[PDB]
RNA sequence: AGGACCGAACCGACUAAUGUUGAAAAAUUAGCGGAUGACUUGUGGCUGGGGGUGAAAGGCCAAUCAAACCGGGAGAUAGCU
RNA sequence: GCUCGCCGGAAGACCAAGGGUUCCUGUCCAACGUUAAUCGGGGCAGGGUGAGUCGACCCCUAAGGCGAGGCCGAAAGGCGUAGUCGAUGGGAAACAGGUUAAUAUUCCUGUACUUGGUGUUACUGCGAAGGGGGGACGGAGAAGGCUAUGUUGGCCGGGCGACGGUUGUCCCGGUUUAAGCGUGUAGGCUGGUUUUCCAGGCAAAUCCGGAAAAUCAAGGCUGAGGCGUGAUGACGAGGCACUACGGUGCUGAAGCAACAAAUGCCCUGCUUCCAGGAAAAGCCUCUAAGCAUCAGGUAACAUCAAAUCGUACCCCAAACCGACACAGGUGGUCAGGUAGAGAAUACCAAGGCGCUUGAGAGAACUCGGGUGAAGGAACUAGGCAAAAUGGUGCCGUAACUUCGGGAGAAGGCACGCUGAUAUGUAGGUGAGGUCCCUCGCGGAUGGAGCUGAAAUCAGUCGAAGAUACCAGCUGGCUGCAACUGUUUAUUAAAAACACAGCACUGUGCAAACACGAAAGUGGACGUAUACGGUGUGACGCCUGCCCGGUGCCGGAAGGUUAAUU
RNA sequence: AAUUCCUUGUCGGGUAAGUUCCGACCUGCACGAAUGGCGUAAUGAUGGCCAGGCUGUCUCCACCCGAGACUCAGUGAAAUU
RNA sequence: UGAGCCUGUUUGAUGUUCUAACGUUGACCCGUAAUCCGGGUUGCGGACAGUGUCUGGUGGGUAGUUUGACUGGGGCGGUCU
């Protein structure tokens, strides 16, 4: 039986990456929120 | 020529096809080609805007000449060719200075025929003249609507326009729909009428035939639920209401033209 | 020649038995339909919630759909247990 | 270590995606491994990934994204020109042998190839953001020539058999060699050269396009395979001595021919059909501004350079997606023997495994299977399940029909082994020899050698000769939908949806219509033989009466009515 | 009759015996002409009925071959209360 | 041509002609190496078309809501001073 999660690094980075977040206005608010909380990992960049 | 298909299969029992053993069997002229890609009926917002479009065969675009503004140089027809972007064949023409072009094919245009354009050309099929210099009571095709713009009327297969009267700087024309219109007399038209008049005698015969042309199925509004269409719902088969479009306007009789800028050029409407 | 015929790889899901704190939160065994076409498959791209897509079943939109998920108004209101 | 069993179009070998030390060596058995454990993909320490030719980085673009000025919008923001990114696509160059406990087209041996910089010689019209060619393109079908590959002979080395025979028409093993360089074959396409002229290619042209003459008819391009060289080399059964059982040093015989044959190559070719089958760069050519003593260009030599990153291990899986060491899912390549039409099925080769709790016993009952007296649907809501037919060749076959069908209708007969026709036939392949030639990968004849179905006639064994696996049950009368297709992922696959055909109505192009507070975009680079909406649903014969009610279309004389005054 | 309440209407054929099936009658509770009427060769994992062959479906069950259940050594759950 | 006003007065309406506001998804030139944009020259329409404020009509396309009690269970029937 096939399932939901099928990995691909190109798609992952093009969807939830640092430059993608920086692109628009709401992603920068996501970054601000996570910095305020004090997270160790900020994005999915590896 | 029209031919029926033998009933060797249920998908061939009802097929009628048109064959012309005079079109080219080869590649089109290359310096007059461009790319063309499909849309699916979607616009720059990504939404479906016109329904029942998708799929089909790959096609290429041929640069056809609609202006005919090269005056004084006779041209000779070379060959007739098949075009996938319209219902009318096309013709390749060679000029006396070494230039080739594509034109629409009137009825009875064969290889070895002369054609010409301008104010000092003869009155015979394929020639192009300003409409000020044609007898009243003539049949033409590919008629312009403004001087120097191009052709927009009578471009399909087996269609033509008729000149009825002339006065002032205007000419009165009878169109296929059954309407009388006024246009300027400095416009242009070509003598004759378009070919492939048997185009309408064919039968596709099966659903894949329509699939090959990019047409997708149509779903009736009475087969849906009342949240998708104003015709939906009912235990069994129920209509009980007036026909309407998917967005609530009444079909079968209502009129939908509203343009006060162009109402002075319609002398009488279709009946 | 064919939305032609029989039949493996490939795509499906008509019948029966097992299983039901299962080997499996939809499977196994024996049979079954299509199989050159309106066919099937890899890599990318587009459509965002009273909105999308839909050969139309109130179908699908990350095991959730007669209006997705997350965080807020918020200690919503409860003549009821 | 010996014997037994299973897979073998996979349960063998290898790439990409995904994972990240799971790879090799030494040591340990507390926790993990559904049992013990000296074992482990477990704990601890060390070791291991070598590139001018493999990939990435690089040059060019498709769908799409972003977007200086610009056009719109209460703000936030939306769309787009010039440009700049984006592969799943196009663009230079390497082979065979040997070696490690773990790397190999990378290290060693032998023999190659591609692109740039600098210097010396010889000749010399160079130069782009521009003009042209090329790259450059569909579906099906057919048969001609080849190779990978296999079988049998010849040759070489060994053998003479645990129980009757085995010096022969006997048994086992081997018989391998690349890239590069030279030759232009089977076969495909195309007339060559000189001269004059011209409303075309945003300006120029010696280039492309068009027109008119003389002249010779054989030139030009592409092209699998074979042959020679690479190779007096490398590899190869066995032999010569010490064993830490992992090798070292030496040596090394044969290394030919015939037949059969791909889904691979010639082939991006040839023949047909309509639904008419990408773009840019690398490459070849022509000139403008500009330069002419120079600079640049063409060829032969010499020499320098080719940087940085990946390279271990797993891939029908115990290492990826499923919470598990889970009977599930996961793109591409390789294709041996006998029987067979076959990539089905049965038994084997190369290779790999016996699935991480065992020992006994032989009760009821449950699960998966074999056989059964006489009867033969009497069972049951219902022949549900089981039983049954099953191949090839030749006879033979009804009502009805849209003349194609129904049809494999239905029902029959033959089928093993041995000998003769013929010490191996009809057919395929084809050497020596004899002639010829424009002289070579040439033509005519000639048949040695090899391979080889189907039929008839006569004998013979069993109960049974399509003997195993494999492999349609058949007919008669009716409802529905014309047909192939689609649908409720997870209790409904249908008479439900779609379909080809028919009718009504709207739309004259800045079209009707749809997404958008707008700019804009699709419909369409289409033009009434076209486009949108609605109902019916192949084909044959047809489709009657009603305009009072509700809608739609036309009318203008009357009555009634808003803001404003 | 995919439409008919009274209804297993009445007549005929098929069975020893037929509320289902096939052909007719007209008394259409409450058919009817593009939310089409009546027919129709071929096709359908579609609804209904009748035959040949075949049988453990059945009268009515018997024996045999494997996997559990049972005894011994190791490890070792769950619902509920 | 309707009311004022002595063939002159301003406004009312109707019809024909004109260009200068406004439109151009007609042709050529420049920014420019550019099928957006702007400037220029020339044709075609022309006080019409179109936009802002106010105002009558149509409007299940969309939205917010309502649709009573008694009762030998509820509904139908009946009742509520």
Curated annotation (Swiss-Prot), chain A:
It comes from the Bacteria. Keywords: Ribonucleoprotein, Ribosomal protein. GO terms for molecular function: structural constituent of ribosome. GO terms for biological process: cytoplasmic translation. NCBIfam families: rpmH_bact (TIGR01030). PANTHER family: LARGE RIBOSOMAL SUBUNIT PROTEIN BL34M, MITOCHONDRIAL RIBOSOMAL PROTEIN 34 FAMILY MEMBER. Belongs to the bacterial ribosomal protein bL34 family. Part of the 50S ribosomal subunit. This is Large ribosomal subunit protein bL34.
From Swiss-Prot, chain B:
InterPro entries: NA-bd_OB-fold, Rib_uL2_dom2, Ribosomal_uL2, Ribosomal_uL2_bac/org-type, Ribosomal_uL2_C, Ribosomal_uL2_CS, Ribosomal_uL2_dom3, Ribosomal_uL2_RNA-bd_dom. The modification N6-acetyllysine is found at residue 241. SUPFAM superfamilies: Nucleic acid-binding proteins, Translation proteins SH3-like domain. GO terms for cellular component: cytoplasm; cytosol; cytosolic large ribosomal subunit; DnaA-L2 complex. It comes from the Bacteria. Keywords: Acetylation, Ribonucleoprotein, Ribosomal protein, RNA-binding, rRNA-binding. One of its GO terms (molecular function) is RNA binding. Residues 27-52, 220-271 are annotated as: Disordered. GO terms for biological process: cytoplasmic translation; negative regulation of DNA-templated DNA replication initiation; ribosomal large subunit assembly. Residues 38-47 have a biased composition (Low complexity). One of the primary rRNA binding proteins. Located near the base of the L1 stalk, it is probably also mobile. Required for association of the 30S and 50S subunits to form the 70S ribosome, for tRNA binding and peptide bond formation. It has been suggested to have peptidyltransferase activity; this is highly controversial. Part of the 50S ribosomal subunit. Forms a bridge to the 30S subunit in the 70S ribosome, contacting the 16S rRNA. Interacts weakly with S6 in one of the 3.5 A resolved structures. In pull-down experiments interacts with CedA. This protein can be partially replaced in vivo by its H.marismortui (HmaL2) or human (L8, from the 60S cytoplasmic ribosome) homolog. Belongs to the universal ribosomal protein uL2 family. This is Large ribosomal subunit protein uL2. It comes from Escherichia coli (strain K12).
């Amino acid at each position: 039986m096939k399932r939901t999660f099928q990995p691909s690094v190109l798609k992952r980075n093009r969807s939830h990456g640092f430059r993608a977040r920086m692109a628009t206005k709401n992603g920068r608010q996501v970054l601000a929120r996570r910095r305020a909380k004090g997270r160790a990992r900020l994005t999915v960049s590896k | 020529a029209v031919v029926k298909c033998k009933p060797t299969s249920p998908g061939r029992r009802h097929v009628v096809k048109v064959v012309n053993p005079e079109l080219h069997k080869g590649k089109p002229f290359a310096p007059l080609l461009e790319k063309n890609s499909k849309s699916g009926g979607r616009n720059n917002n990504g939404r479906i805007t016109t329904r029942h479009i998708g799929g089909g065969h790959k096609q290429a675009y041929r640069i056809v000449d609609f202006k005919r503004n090269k005056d004084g140089i006779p041209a000779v027809v070379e060959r007739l060719e098949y075009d996938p972007n319209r219902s009318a064949n096309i013709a390749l023409v060679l000029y006396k200075d070494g230039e080739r072009r594509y034109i629409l094919a009137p009825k009875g245009l064969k290889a070895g025929d002369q054609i010409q354009s301008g104010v000092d050309a003869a009155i015979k099929p394929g020639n192009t003249l300003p409409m000020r210099n044609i007898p009243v009571g003539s049949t033409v095709h590919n008629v312009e609507m403004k001087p120097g713009k191009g052709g927009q009327l009578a471009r399909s297969a087996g269609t033509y326009v008729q000149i009825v009267a002339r006065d002032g700087a205007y000419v009165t024309l009878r169109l296929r729909s059954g309407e009388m219109r006024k246009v300027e007399a400095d416009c242009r038209a070509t003598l004759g009428e378009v070919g492939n008049a048997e185009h309408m005698l064919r039968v596709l015969g099966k659903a894949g035939a329509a699939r090959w042309r990019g047409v997708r199925p149509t779903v009736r509004g009475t087969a849906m639920n009342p949240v998708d269409h104003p015709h939906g719902g009912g235990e069994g088969r129920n209509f009980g209401k007036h026909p309407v479009t998917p967005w609530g306007v009444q079909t079968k009789g209502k009129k939908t033209r509203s343009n006060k800028r162009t109402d002075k050029f319609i002398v009488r409407r279709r009946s």
